[PDB]
A paper describes a structure:
Bacterial homologous lysine and arginine decarboxylases play major roles in the acid stress response, physiology, antibiotic resistance and virulence. Inducible AAT-fold basic amino acid decarboxylases (LAOdcs) have been studied since the early 1940s1,2 because of the link between their enterobacterial pathogenicity in humans and their ability to overcome the aggressive pH environments and oxygen limitation in our gastrointestinal tract. These enzymes decarboxylate either Lysine (LdcI, also called CadA), Arginine (Adc or AdiA) or Ornithine (OdcI or SpeF) into corresponding polyamines while consuming protons and producing CO2, thereby buffering the bacterial cytosol and the extracellular medium to promote bacterial survival under acid stress conditions. Here we show that the Adc from a multidrug-resistant human pathogen Providencia stuartii massively polymerises into filaments whose cryo-EM structure reveals pronounced differences between Adc and LdcI assembly mechanisms. Like all proteobacterial LAOdcs, the P. stuartii Adc monomer is organized in three different structural parts.
In the decameric double ring, two monomers form a C2-symmetric dimer, which represents the basic unit of the structure and forms a decameric assembly through strong inter-ring contacts between adjacent dimers. This type of dimerisation is typical for proteobacterial LAOdcs and for pyridoxal 5′-phosphate (PLP)-dependent enzymes in general, and leads to a completion of the active sites of each monomer buried into a cleft at the dimer interface. The N-terminal wing domain protrudes into the centre of the double ring and is involved in stabilisation of the decamer assembly though inter-dimer contacts (residues 1-139). The C-terminal domain (residues 609-758), located at the decamer periphery, partially constitutes an entry channel into the active site. At the sequence level, the wing domains of the P. stuartii and the E. coli Adc proteins are the most different (52.14% identity) whereas the PLP-binding domain is the most conserved (77.33% identity). Although the exact residues involved in both dimerisation and decamerisation of the P. stuartii and E. coli Adcs differ, the buried surface area (BSA) and predicted ∆G upon decamerisation is similar for both proteins. In contrast, our Mass Photometry analysis of P. stuartii Adc indicates the presence of the decameric species at pH 5 and 6.5, whereas lower molecular weight species are detected at pH 8 but also unexpectedly at pH 4.
Residue numbers in the entry:
A (entry chain F): 1 to 190
B (entry chain D), C (entry chain C): 1 to 755
Write the structure that this text describes.
Amino acid sequence: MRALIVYTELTDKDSVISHAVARLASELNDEHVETVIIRDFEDGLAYIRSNTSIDCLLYGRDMSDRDEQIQAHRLITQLHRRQEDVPVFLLSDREEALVAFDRNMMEQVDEFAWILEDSADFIAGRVLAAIQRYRSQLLPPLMKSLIKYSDVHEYSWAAPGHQGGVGFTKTPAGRIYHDFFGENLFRTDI
Amino acid sequence: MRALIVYTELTDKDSVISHAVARLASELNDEHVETVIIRDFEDGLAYIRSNTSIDCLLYGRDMSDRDEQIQAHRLITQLHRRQEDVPVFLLSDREEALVAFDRNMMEQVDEFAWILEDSADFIAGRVLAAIQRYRSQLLPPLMKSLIKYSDVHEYSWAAPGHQGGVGFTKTPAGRIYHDFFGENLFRTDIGIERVAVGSLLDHTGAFGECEKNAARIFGADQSYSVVVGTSGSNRTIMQACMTDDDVVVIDRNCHKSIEQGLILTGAKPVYMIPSRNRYGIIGPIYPKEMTPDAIKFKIAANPLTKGKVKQKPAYSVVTNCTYDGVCYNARKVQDLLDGSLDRIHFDEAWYGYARFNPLYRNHFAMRDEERTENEPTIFATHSTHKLLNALSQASFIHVRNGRNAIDFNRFNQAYLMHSTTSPLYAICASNDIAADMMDGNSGRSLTDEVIRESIDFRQSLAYLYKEFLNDDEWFFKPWNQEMVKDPATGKRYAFEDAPVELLMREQSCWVMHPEDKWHGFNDIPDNWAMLDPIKVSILAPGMGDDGKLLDTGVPAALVTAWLNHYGIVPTRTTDFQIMFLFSMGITKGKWGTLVNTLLSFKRHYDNNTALKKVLPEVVASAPEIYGEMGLRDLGDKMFAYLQKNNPGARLNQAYSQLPQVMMTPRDAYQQIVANRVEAVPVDQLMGRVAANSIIPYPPGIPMLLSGENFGDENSPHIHYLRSLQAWDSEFPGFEHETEGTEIIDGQYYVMCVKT
Amino acid sequence: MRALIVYTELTDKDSVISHAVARLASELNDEHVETVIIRDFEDGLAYIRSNTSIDCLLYGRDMSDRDEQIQAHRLITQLHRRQEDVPVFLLSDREEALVAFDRNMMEQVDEFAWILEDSADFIAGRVLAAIQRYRSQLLPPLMKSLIKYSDVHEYSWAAPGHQGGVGFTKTPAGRIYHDFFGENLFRTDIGIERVAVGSLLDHTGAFGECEKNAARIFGADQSYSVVVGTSGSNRTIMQACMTDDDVVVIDRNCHKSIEQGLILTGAKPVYMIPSRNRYGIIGPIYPKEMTPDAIKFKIAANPLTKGKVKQKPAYSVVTNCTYDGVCYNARKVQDLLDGSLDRIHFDEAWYGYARFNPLYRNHFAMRDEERTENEPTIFATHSTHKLLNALSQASFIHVRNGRNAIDFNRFNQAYLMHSTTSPLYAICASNDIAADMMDGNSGRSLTDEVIRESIDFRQSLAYLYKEFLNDDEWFFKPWNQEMVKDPATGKRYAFEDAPVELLMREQSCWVMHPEDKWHGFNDIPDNWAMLDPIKVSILAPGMGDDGKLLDTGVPAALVTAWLNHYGIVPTRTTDFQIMFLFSMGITKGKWGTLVNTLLSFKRHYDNNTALKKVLPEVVASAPEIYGEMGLRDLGDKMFAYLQKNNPGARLNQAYSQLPQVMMTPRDAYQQIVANRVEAVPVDQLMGRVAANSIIPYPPGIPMLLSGENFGDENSPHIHYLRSLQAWDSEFPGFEHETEGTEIIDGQYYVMCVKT
């Protein structure tokens, strides 16, 4: 589980937003969510264009700057080109975000996180819930069922005879073969 | 133990103050006091607005800058909103602080720490002493005594038999259970025979202190902690107030525990009928139901009480607020009922926070007022788990003594009759902590948080509604005023354009005015009812402002299914109405999720997405009809059904006529006990007496009670039951609820008295 | 996950088997399976007798030694006493195990592991699969579903408002509360609107599975889980069974919830009078109270029911066992009452374990028998928290349908009338786990442990009694048989000399025989009553075997004060009787502590130690009389008081005559409601009607109920109240309890009906 936090300048004194984002990142790392913190939309865009899985996007911008609004929209569109249903939270001061509320905001924002006036534990819980919801819908049906059933290891009394690859691990060449191709290939040969 | 040090610029060279604060932080960390150092009041304020426990605040400012003086005052006020008695030390140069000394300084400063000329060890010692003093007074009495006694582990030779959870750790499943719920839950299950704690039933020890503290907080003369919920609370109040030879005045909008009390006492009920609007929302009882004339008319017209017209009613019950968030003006309700009654019961099960925010002023039972001697006795039941912070089954009875009051010895018999001899002290401790969380500044702070959250949701939803309207498109709108008026400046506002401080401060922005069209309770007096902001109803399109369906619409059953798919279970629902609850357990900004979900619905409703993708659990009900079909198609089918059959007029006819009463609820229940009852199909209910209550959803309030007649072949009540059954058969998976009926072969049976 | 490997000597050179087991243990530790390796069956047995969860047993023995075969069989049987379905693998050489293959092997072996010729990875995989299979079936249904659903954290938009405990973590005291009780308690407080779990009130989901499982375990047709305790259980059974026009047969040894049910139903009661012994212990109702002749006589002699002699009683209640541990032969009780009754209620609140040990055979309600069609309906209430392992307020109703049964639709109305609409699911989960702990082998194992513990205490105390007797000195003796008789060999035994297996196996060693002098219930039939071994009464010296006080003695009030000083609070106490409770939460050998304490008393009683040293809390009551005084001095003063006033004959006269009945309990309670009542001093109770019940301790059962007359100036009941008051005034700090009286100025007031 990995969350990307892209924020540029949310307070007139960057200390406040920096410490709030630090507390949030600490809570996320406590619930086993790796975090990547980026301070510019260009670097965030370059990070998204690498083939890294991002399970949640938390961004915050100036909220009075149209240039950063366009940059953030471009960021989220780039994110959803290949990672289409990733949750996006808006990190913002409450009032700056409520004066900017409209349909265009909600077409790209999934959640609000008032970072400056809320517990980081609460936001982290909501992030983790959104990540779990996202990952439960990610795989296509057959792959999902095969990955679930590959955890079942017992000896069935029917073919294939290698029985999830157990048959191979009885000669040394068979053990080399089995280690080369890995266990899951043979566990899905059901 | 955690100390927050917020200092900005105390010396002309920041090195001096920085090194002094570093030495102080080192000494505090040596005495086991975690420290958080912040260099700006904005970041300190943001840190305080997280739910972190702060045991001491040490701050220092410029001392020549008025802007930082205001920032520091705001910081300390924010700190004390929820952490009310935290010690505050001033970190300062001696002379700059002594020239600034006055009453205003000492109203917020508790201690001085001359950081630049004193040992850090001395300051740390004084900080630690202040922290210990603060933490010794933090817990409420019962919780404090239970936490102390939970350290006692020895085998007592008496029940409960699990002996602090030791009994569970003897089988493997018991060990899993014990590890899941933890040791402390079982260590506090001690039994009523420990004099170190007291007993609930005797009202002694920490339990007496708890109930006196709760009476202080909630503004009552006496308070009673209940471990059977507001069911038990209502049941014991009714058992104490009325007897078999009494007549009582019952809000027809009553919880089933009220009829349980009627069955257990045997009293003869008279009903005040509430009002409806076009959306099927149950509204307030009008004042013309409560006047002494109306009550004497109702008594004289009742087949059971017409021989009691010379008799004063012994009890009345009013539900405030209603399930849909309608709050009565309880001052005026009390003044009307004081003309006929000595005892008034307010079932405030959903309405326990109301005392702790000025927005609800005069709209609850236990008010801060000058109390006359000629006042009636006032009972108020709170379900502490519904909207306060307590475990299930926790409840309070609050008594404000007046005319014809019930003293303690008489009331305790009814109290014991409906209680247990072995109460679970975790429930009592949750009552204690729930009353504590509302005491002082924290009650106001928490109710403000919830109300601001709900107002944000309301204004955002109204904004989106107008915005889709400019696109000539449909959307969900909140059920509240469209235009508000600032009384001070006289300026008018669209609801979504009004300032949040106006809506949180001004009570008239929530009153139902007889000239406004939003609430739909025609002919309501002014300043009689109010909308509770945190019971947020949203209206699906389809109902017209005059009471007839529009050409097109979206039924709320489909949107409710959509929401249930996503884990969002609404509390209340009608044909076009969905009620969401904002509680003090909600977090800030969560409502955005809800907005998002609604927007998703609209897209999938406009694209007519196949039900197989979006709502497979609905297709799983009747795959032959719900497969092969889309979302907008099912919506249009439901709306055409509503146009053809129009169950709203059915509801109005069933609830505007009260059924004929044949016997008291106790007599009908005793027909059940005597086995003189039988299940009857709906098509055969003519002239049959109901043996139990029938509560259809909607509207969620009882249509018939025990002992009432279903009526003729033309009775509106049988017609409405048929309407519900017809919906249920037409739309599988979207079946209504009806408490009091069995459903055999998709067909309703009512248990009626044998002829 | 933990695997126990018990192997002794499998190869002629232990190196081979040792290295094979080491490789296996290494593989298991690689798949996250902790291992415990033991080289002897005695140490393995001692390890199993600790309460450690073992998920798999892998054992290997010599395979040519019959002694180790027996040791291994004993090991596996001990394992499955409390961990019943744990997988057992045989570790063996192939051929030694295949020559030993037979049915007896496979009755205890689940898997083979040829440890000497197979990969340790393969064996570890099969062990892990068996462990996972075992753990998936370990929890009972409701607990399993709650543990699964507790992982769901999202904000629901409905009550409870604390939202899985999030609401508490917003004030500092709330955070302390939340940390003390832990997260899982609040995560399981979910409300009744989650279809993943079901609802208690509808009996659906995991709640239906739970109640069906409990009906299976406890031997009932239907079971009902109750969150209001046996108070609520009794109250709902009585509400379902009887009406205002009924006559009912009540054990005069009744819990106050029985009279609460009488008040709530209005039925006219007739009382069966229990017996006493010389120690003031309440014993069984004799069969001559239960015959149809006796019941028709009682009905015809009652001022309230003499117009109902042609009417069949609708209900009877019998308390089994009594508070002092006297168990009726419930087969014979049922056969007697089957001649007058269709419904019999057994209030088995203290007696829930009885089904699960053969020592209680035929002495409880839900028996393993061939069931006739002409049997009456049987109700049984268990207080699952008193002697089973459950949280307070947990209870079961058990129904075995017979004549004039109450079907589900009729019973559920009474069930809902006395319940809450928001049950705390922790209580329901505790019922579920308590029923699970008694299922299978573990019920027998746990009841055996408790009974053996209590028998050890009894025999040790009887031994010390005889040993002090040979020294011609006094001591405490247990209240049980002095001589037991083995029926098989006919051999007689002193109780302290009998084999423990005889006393745990043979039921006749606990029956009260009419020729024995220990129990003191003169004229009792044989094979009618039994002593429950785990309710251990000890007798202080001072009462003679004929009913009169001896020349010297030690009153139990002083010994009770001594025990309370040390944290040992007895359940029951009379003049010379102290009852201790052994529960399944007790640990082994704990009773020694109790023995030690008693011995201490004797020393400090013989040395006449000053009360200031040993019992300062007693001197704190009246320092003018209890200072300056010693322990033996106060004991002699108390005993002289008992000799002069003799309250035992007072108790016998007050409880051998029933008071005159003036009205039903409901009519007296309704006089309370009508405010027609008043407090009255004891000296003025002549001819006054009691408005509530009077329950003096001793004997702890009600002396008067509501609506009964105190009587003339010569009434035994007023005399006994005066005796209690006189004791209380003479000996401050040793005051009796009397439920139903107020104590103003150290003087008793009873709330009586106004004339």
